[PDB]
Amino acid sequence: KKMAFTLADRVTEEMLADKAALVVEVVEENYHDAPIVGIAVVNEHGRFFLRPETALADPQFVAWLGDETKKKSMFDSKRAAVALKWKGIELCGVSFDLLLAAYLLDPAQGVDDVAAAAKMKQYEAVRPDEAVYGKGAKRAVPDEPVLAEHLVRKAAAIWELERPFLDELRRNEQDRLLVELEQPLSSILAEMEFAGVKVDTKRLEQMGKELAEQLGTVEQRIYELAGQEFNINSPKQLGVILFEKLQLPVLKKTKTGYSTSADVLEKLAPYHEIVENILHYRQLGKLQSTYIEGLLKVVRPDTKKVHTIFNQALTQTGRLSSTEPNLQNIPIRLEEGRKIRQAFVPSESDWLIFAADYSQIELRVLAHIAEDDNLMEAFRRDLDIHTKTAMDIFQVSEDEVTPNMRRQAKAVNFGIVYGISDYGLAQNLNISRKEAAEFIERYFESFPGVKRYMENIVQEAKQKGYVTTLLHRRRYLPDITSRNFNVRSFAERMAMNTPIQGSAADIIKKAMIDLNARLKEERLQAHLLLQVHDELILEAPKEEMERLCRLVPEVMEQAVTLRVPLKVDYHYGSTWYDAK
DNA sequence: CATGCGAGTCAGG
DNA sequence: GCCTGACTCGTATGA
Ligand SMILES: OC[C@H]1O[C@@](CO)(O[C@H]2O[C@H](CO)[C@@H](O)[C@H](O)[C@H]2O)[C@@H](O)[C@@H]1O
Ligand SMILES: OC[C@H]1O[C@@](CO)(O[C@H]2O[C@H](CO)[C@@H](O)[C@H](O)[C@H]2O)[C@@H](O)[C@@H]1O
Ligand SMILES: OC[C@H]1O[C@@](CO)(O[C@H]2O[C@H](CO)[C@@H](O)[C@H](O)[C@H]2O)[C@@H](O)[C@@H]1O
Ligand SMILES: [Mg+2]
């Protein structure tokens, strides 16, 4: 039975009630400077559909949109807020976001539309967006009649679902998480995406020309060493050359053929000169295709900026993700790739890039949650945690710690966070499972509190069915009870890791909110550009650097109070590359 | 030929 | 051992 609503030709007073479910539809996946195809409002007075051209041109409606006292309940308010920003319209008063509410209740559901969220509460009087708009090449906005009914049904669902979702969040003790953390953060992410990051395209293009030159040389050297030309970027073709023509040892095979992963190649390097060249070709090719050409494709030609979209409702741990482009995985580990960062510059003359990052936040969080005396003392002394771990595992003085000892202690620390696994550690340290287990055993002997936490958290995950983070984020782990070793083990590691990675996510999100409040109180022009899991990147007038050096680390270090201090390092410079 | 899928790969924390 | 996203190739359908 069709849903009744008024297809309005003009905005009326009853459409501006102080509480309503609001839909400002942007069908385009990437909502930057995208069109708004329709608007729906459901409130105490009824259900309404408004054409965007009329609604967005009406002073009363626009004023209502920007009035913080007029409360709106929506789904993915960031999408609408950013689309409206590109139109010079401010959206305020969003007191409930169904997407974020759904995400907090169960990030595993992968709720990406109103229909999916509504299905969680047995509400199915709304169609999934894909069914209405189609997908990809066939994606398209339907005729007004169909479009109008769909937006109204989504608004109607939101109107009906707010109460039950809020009630469950409250029983989960996640009400403040939604209202005081995720929703306020959504607005901050909206500002960041809209602001964008300036790219020096001329510099990128120049790097691309040089890369193309080097790739050409390595490419030819590879054909020369192989004795024939082939598609180096084809794991299949490369496999034939390496393991058949050149007879290199097959130490690993994928599900469908020979493995040519870098870790595999690294082992074959001693056998033939072609290997080192393939690795070099892989590095340069990655930079060229993904960080030069890929980046250049998404730079807005008019503003010369990239406007990423932070998916705030995707990861199972509470972390954000970044797309079009992904600005959370710009090269930095290898110098040649790190140079890509010289292309990210301040958006204004005489401004500078400022970057602040937490030092070992995950291990500090673990020290706090596990209450491991040794680990807590280590951070209280602000010791080099890898050297310290090496000292305990190997029972040597600081002077006796060799570079390799520290390298292995570092590997154990990087993994201890992801949940112990002799197999996983063995792979990273290229050792036997028996030996890896011995390392783990030694680690636990030195950090008994951590061992206790690992056992206790797995037990809690089994008892309650989920694990939680410092700010009450949760993750259900049904596989924790599986009678399949591998499946159960994966769930156990998630149980061990989620409270760590997740609480670190909670902390930096809170830091972002606290930071913006401080930046506003101080009337600084500085503003956030990016978040990369444990670091914040801002840009600001050079005249604000000294103030930022004191303000940013403090706000980040004081976001939450743990049993150990939080430490933040910072750097600034003319480009993102220089912010080191 | 057209768009779209998985597989394999590798970039980041 | 955890958490992500983008690009290539080669196959899928489909013209
Ligand atoms: O607006 C971001 C928000 O939308 C979802 C769907 O509800 O993702 C859509 O938009 C992303 C950014 O363009 C795309 O990567 C994704 O493919 C598309 O479905 C949510 O996942 C996200 O929180
Ligand atoms: O010149 C392009 C032509 O070369 C082949 C091999 O003969 O592939 C090479 O060039 C591609 C584009 O630069 C790379 O992806 C590939 O790795 C490299 O070997 C052919 O496949 C292609 O038609
Ligand atoms: O040997 C106990 C030890 O094994 C772990 C896995 O590393 O858990 C196993 O044993 C528990 C019973 O003590 C079960 O609840 C669990 O399902 C099973 O995998 C550790 O958590 C535990 O300390
Ligand atoms: Mg750091």
Side-chain angles (χ1 to χ4, degrees), chain A residues 219 223 229-234 281:
Chain A
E219 193 197 323
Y223 300 146
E229 297 190 5
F230 60 106
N231 189 313
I232 306 167
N233 283 315
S234 170
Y281 179 85

Side-chain angles (χ1 to χ4, degrees), chain A residues 357-360 534:
Chain A
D357 67 292
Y358 283 108
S359 175
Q360 304 296 330
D534 71 340

Side-chain angles (χ1 to χ4, degrees), chain A residues 29-31 75-76 79 99 112-113 309 311 313 323-324:
Chain A
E29 287 270 291
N30 186 314
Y31 50 69
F75 179 100
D76 191 2
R79 166 175 291 273
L99 170 66
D112 56 35
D113 69 0
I309 290 183
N311 193 327
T323 68
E324 294 183 285

Side-chain angles (χ1 to χ4, degrees), chain A residues 420 454-455 458-459 462 480 488 492:
Chain A
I420 58 175
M454 299 297 170
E455 306 172 326
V458 170
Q459 161 177 52
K462 172 178 287 191
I480 200 78
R488 183 177 64 260
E492 303 188 323

Side-chain angles (χ1 to χ4, degrees), chain A residues 289-561:
Chain A
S289 297
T290 301
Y291 300 106
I292 295 299
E293 312 183 319
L295 196 51
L296 287 173
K297 286 183 179 300
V298 295
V299 172
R300 305 255 158 185
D302 55 310
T303 65
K304 302 300 176 183
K305 294 177 175 184
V306 283
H307 298 266
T308 190
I309 290 183
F310 288 107
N311 193 327
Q312 184 182 2
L314 175 74
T315 78
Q316 307 302 299
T317 56
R319 277 187 174 186
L320 300 174
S321 76
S322 173
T323 68
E324 294 183 285
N326 178 354
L327 294 179
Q328 301 186 309
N329 78 335
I330 303 301
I332 191 170
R333 298 176 191 178
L334 301 180
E335 182 51 41
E336 301 182 72
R338 187 172 194 166
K339 283 181 162 55
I340 289 298
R341 296 187 176 212
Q342 305 183 316
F344 292 82
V345 306
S347 64
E348 290 181 53
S349 302
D350 303 304
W351 275 45
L352 299 173
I353 301 304
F354 180 102
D357 67 292
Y358 283 108
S359 175
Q360 304 296 330
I361 188 172
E362 286 183 342
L363 281 173
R364 284 172 187 268
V365 163
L366 172 58
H368 171 84
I369 60 180
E371 290 181 270
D372 185 286
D373 296 324
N374 190 34
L375 195 59
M376 290 190 294
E377 173 69 4
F379 282 119
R380 283 167 178 165
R381 297 183 190 182
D382 189 35
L383 303 178
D384 180 307
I385 195 57
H386 305 311
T387 294
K388 159 64 176 174
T389 296
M391 286 170 71
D392 296 331
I393 289 178
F394 302 119
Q395 300 150 43
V396 301
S397 67
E398 188 173 311
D399 290 357
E400 298 176 297
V401 174
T402 62
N404 196 41
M405 279 172 68
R406 184 173 186 286
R407 180 182 68 83
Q408 298 185 77
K410 182 176 180 174
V412 177
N413 279 328
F414 258 67
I416 198 70
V417 172
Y418 312 145
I420 58 175
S421 173
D422 40 46
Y423 168 64
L425 181 60
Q427 283 295 304
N428 284 181
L429 292 178
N430 191 44
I431 57 178
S432 72
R433 178 270 297 181
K434 175 185 295 300
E435 292 178 297
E438 300 180 3
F439 273 65
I440 303 297
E441 173 181 54
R442 282 302 184 68
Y443 178 95
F444 288 138
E445 293 175 359
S446 302
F447 300 103
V450 172
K451 184 186 184 183
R452 177 180 62 255
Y453 159 73
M454 299 297 170
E455 306 172 326
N456 285 346
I457 193 65
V458 170
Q459 161 177 52
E460 187 166 7
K462 172 178 287 191
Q463 182 262 303
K464 293 185 186 176
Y466 61 93
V467 293
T468 65
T469 66
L470 271 48
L471 298 198
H472 309 306
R473 189 182 304 283
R474 69 168 58 180
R475 185 179 185 178
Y476 289 101
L477 297 170
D479 291 348
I480 200 78
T481 61
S482 172
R483 275 73 71 210
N484 177 290
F485 184 74
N486 297 325
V487 172
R488 183 177 64 260
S489 291
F490 190 20
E492 303 188 323
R493 293 196 295 281
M494 290 181 189
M496 293 174 251
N497 173 259
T498 297
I500 301 180
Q501 179 178 134
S503 296
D506 290 345
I507 298 170
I508 192 165
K509 285 181 166 177
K510 162 75 151 57
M512 291 170 78
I513 295 168
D514 293 345
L515 178 58
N516 266 39
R518 293 301 310 292
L519 291 174
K520 188 177 182 179
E521 305 180 324
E522 300 302 317
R523 325 307 205 203
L524 292 170
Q525 287 179 271
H527 59 234
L528 283 164
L529 293 180
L530 305 171
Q531 186 250 51
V532 190
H533 310 307
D534 71 340
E535 65 168 352
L536 297 181
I537 311 298
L538 298 81
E539 66 176 357
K542 59 186 181 300
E543 293 85 356
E544 303 190 347
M545 292 301 100
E546 295 195 71
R547 274 177 291 176
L548 288 186
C549 286
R550 283 176 54 82
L551 188 176
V552 181
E554 178 61 16
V555 175
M556 291 177 72
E557 296 174 339
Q558 296 302 314
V560 300
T561 296

Side-chain angles (χ1 to χ4, degrees), chain A residues 31-61:
Chain A
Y31 50 69
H32 283 296
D33 213 11
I36 292 173
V37 308
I39 292 173
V41 172
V42 169
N43 57 34
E44 61 190 296
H45 306 299
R47 316 194 186 87
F48 315 83
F49 173 81
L50 286 167
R51 297 186 180 77
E53 57 278 10
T54 75
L56 300 186
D58 183 289
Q60 284 58 60
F61 189 76

